[PDB]
Amino acid sequence: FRQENVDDYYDTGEELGSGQFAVVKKCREKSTGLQYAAKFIKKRRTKSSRRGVSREDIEREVSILKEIQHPNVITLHEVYENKTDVILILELVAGGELFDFLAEKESLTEEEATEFLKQILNGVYYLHSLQIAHFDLKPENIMLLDRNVPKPRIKIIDFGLAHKIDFGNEFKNIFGTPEFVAPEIVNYEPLGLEADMWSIGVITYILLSGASPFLGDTKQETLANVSAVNYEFEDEYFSNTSALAKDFIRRLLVKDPKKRMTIQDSLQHPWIKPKDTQQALSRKAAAVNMEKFKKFAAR
């Protein structure tokens, strides 16, 4: 990587986000005036240290981000590193989370919702085409480039858990957020591209109903709901949801990864690509449960 000082090439501004051993700050490149996001990642530095991120893990993230160029994924611009930190100079995604944005609309049909969902599917299609599992797909890693345009571009971010899947599966850690992680992750079994598809199912479920499907009253119950694939389409939230949409979700929230809809299949699903007008109208007439979705988005 680049061993020079960040601060000789960039000025930094306000913090944008912070993780356990990472902070994102807004920055501006001196030589072009272009603005970026700088993600400072703390290295643990010694293998036995537990106060940072494994440098190998950092390289993995960097290695993946350098390979991807796609409108619905964040771009990597430059990488710096000093004694304590590796700094990723990333594309600045300024528009905030997708769900906060959708939360401001007065209503939302399933057809409009699929317009945004389709962009997520597109990004993931690209990633999966390159054998890349994201492994941390959840509403907060779905951002907008700019919330002030006719049709806003979705940006998939945070590749901190992402892996190349060369052998159809990988046997590792890879544990993200209880609410959105597939059963095989919860149960520490081998992990593949299909984990991402489960996550897509959870996001979709929340997008239409405002409800989290496997959210227990404690974190441990949440993981247990997930493992058992214990979810319902409770009438209180789904009474205005299409059968197509329900069928879409049902084919992703499948315990066996192997049985789960692939990204190629989900892009071909009639909820996503209606094969006839009746299906098209069905999706047009169904609606997002907007008052509960707004409450979820505000949590």
From Swiss-Prot:
Keywords: ANK repeat, Apoptosis, ATP-binding, Calmodulin-binding, Cytoplasm, Cytoskeleton, GTP-binding, Kinase, Nucleotide-binding, Phosphoprotein, Repeat, Serine/threonine-protein kinase, Transferase, Translation regulation, Ubl conjugation. Calcium/calmodulin-dependent serine/threonine kinase involved in multiple cellular signaling pathways that trigger cell survival, apoptosis, and autophagy. Regulates both type I apoptotic and type II autophagic cell deaths signal, depending on the cellular setting. The former is caspase-dependent, while the latter is caspase-independent and is characterized by the accumulation of autophagic vesicles. Phosphorylates PIN1 resulting in inhibition of its catalytic activity, nuclear localization, and cellular function. Phosphorylates TPM1, enhancing stress fiber formation in endothelial cells. GO terms for cellular component: actin cytoskeleton; cytoplasm; DAPK1-calmodulin complex; glutamatergic synapse; nucleus; plasma membrane; postsynaptic density. Transmembrane segments: none annotated. Ubiquitinated by the BCR(KLHL20) E3 ubiquitin ligase complex, leading to its degradation by the proteasome. The modification Phosphoserine is found at A286. Coiled coil: none annotated. This is Death-associated protein kinase 1. Residues 10-272 form the Protein kinase domain. Interacts with KLHL20. Interacts (via death domain) with MAPK1 and MAPK3. Interacts with MAP1B (via N-terminus). Interacts with PRKD1 in an oxidative stress-regulated manner. Interacts with PIN1, PDCD6, BECN1, TSC2 and STX1A. Interacts (via kinase domain) with DAPK3 (via kinase domain). Interacts with GRINB. Interacts (via death domain) with UNC5B (via death domain). Interacts with UNC5C (via death domain). The active site is at D136 (proton acceptor). One of its GO terms (molecular function) is identical protein binding. GO terms for biological process: apoptotic process; apoptotic signaling pathway; cellular response to hydroperoxide; cellular response to type II interferon; defense response to tumor cell; extrinsic apoptotic signaling pathway via death domain receptors; intracellular signal transduction; negative regulation of apoptotic process. The autoinhibitory domain sterically blocks the substrate peptide-binding site by making both hydrophobic and electrostatic contacts with the kinase core. It comes from the Eukaryota.
